[PDB]
Design a protein around this ligand. Sequence first.
Ligand SMILES: CC(C)CN(C[C@@H](O)[C@H](Cc1cccc(F)c1)NC(=O)O[C@H]1[C@H]2CO[C@H]3OC[C@@H]1[C@H]3C2)S(=O)(=O)c1ccc2nc(NC3CC3)sc2c1
Lengths: 99, 99
Amino acid sequence: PQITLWQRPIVTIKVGGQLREALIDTGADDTIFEEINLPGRWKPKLIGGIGGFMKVRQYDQIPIEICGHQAIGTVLVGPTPINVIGRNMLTQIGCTLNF
Amino acid sequence: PQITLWQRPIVTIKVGGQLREALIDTGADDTIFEEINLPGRWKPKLIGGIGGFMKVRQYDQIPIEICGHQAIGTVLVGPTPINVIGRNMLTQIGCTLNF
Ligand SMILES: CC(C)CN(C[C@@H](O)[C@H](Cc1cccc(F)c1)NC(=O)O[C@H]1[C@H]2CO[C@H]3OC[C@@H]1[C@H]3C2)S(=O)(=O)c1ccc2nc(NC3CC3)sc2c1
């Protein structure tokens, strides 16, 4: 779809067999969720944002469905105030900006 | 223009008579710059992101040029790791997401 920006661009996600909502975030390089439970091995990672850094778990090659579109890629899990879909996933679903 | 997401969506800005680069950020409600010098009165504000909060100065009704498009609105000034154009400004320039 086309999504305008009068409201936060929140969409419905399926990841790890669980349903969540997440913000389409062109300012995020990576994809971050709080409170999902993903299977298998992970690596600890520190990431930076406004207000400093955050410790996350890094999971690789995770399938995700983003507003009905399929992608696979790295998902970070940690205490983000809102779930975000970043460019690693947005490029796979053909998402662009336009003005 | 249309902007794809293979790279960070960075554009050229003029604000307060100064030239800067900033990220088109659909996950940002507000617009934040580091190291600009804006005129007039401001109000201190605490804002939240990943990794916690940040103290900013809030300036209202600031003119800005975003990739050649004119807007006016609130600009926050404080120690962001990258300058961001948020939805308060993006709606004025007709920016949309599309997939
Ligand atoms: C700050 C930008 C540049 C980056 N962030 C993406 C922005 O869109 C975040 C999303 C958000 C919204 C709300 C609360 C939040 F906690 C977070 N917006 C944000 O903080 O807005 C703030 C600020 C603007 O006005 C209002 O609107 C929401 C809130 C409030 C004050 S990020 O989440 O830190 C992130 C994401 C992925 C990523 N992947 C990385 N990988 C390695 C480097 C390669 S680093 C990295 C860092």
